[PDB]
Design a protein around this ligand. Structure first.
Ligand SMILES: [Zn+2]
Ligand SMILES: [Zn+2]
Ligand SMILES: [Zn+2]
Ligand SMILES: [Zn+2]
Ligand SMILES: [Zn+2]
Length: 107
């Protein structure tokens, strides 16, 4: 039985099984997305450039600037989980990149 390592906003994250979870809602994500989410949480409330995200989350793969942007949309979509009352988790900072806007608790 697996312990969450971190809480991002309303979601407990358990990277060992690629899972996020919220109040009786469990979701498995792709591992790269977990890795992106974990990177944001380690650098929370910091502006992260497309470049920082590529270097750290896509290590030893080349990707386009555009893979990042579509990964970001997929992660926003999973973090929202169809709840229109959800905060913004990942905010776009114009011309600069992205910032994780929710509280993080490490366990
Ligand atoms: Zn940091
Ligand atoms: Zn940082
Ligand atoms: Zn993609
Ligand atoms: Zn993806
Ligand atoms: Zn996908």
């Amino acid at each position: 039985a697996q312990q969450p390592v971190v809480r991002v906003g309303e979601w407990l994250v358990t990277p060992s099984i690629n899972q996020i979870s919220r109040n009786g809602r469990q979701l498995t994500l792709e591992p790269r997305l977990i890795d992106l989410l974990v990177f944001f949480a380690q650098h929370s409330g910091e502006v992260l450039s497309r470049d920082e995200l590529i270097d750290n989350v896509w290590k030893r793969s080349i990707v386009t600037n555009h893979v990042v942007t579509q990964s970001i949309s997929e992660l926003r979509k999973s973090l929202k989980d169809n709840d229109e009352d959800s905060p913004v988790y990942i905010a776009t900072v114009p011309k600069r990149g992205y910032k994780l806007m929710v509280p993080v608790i490490w366990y």
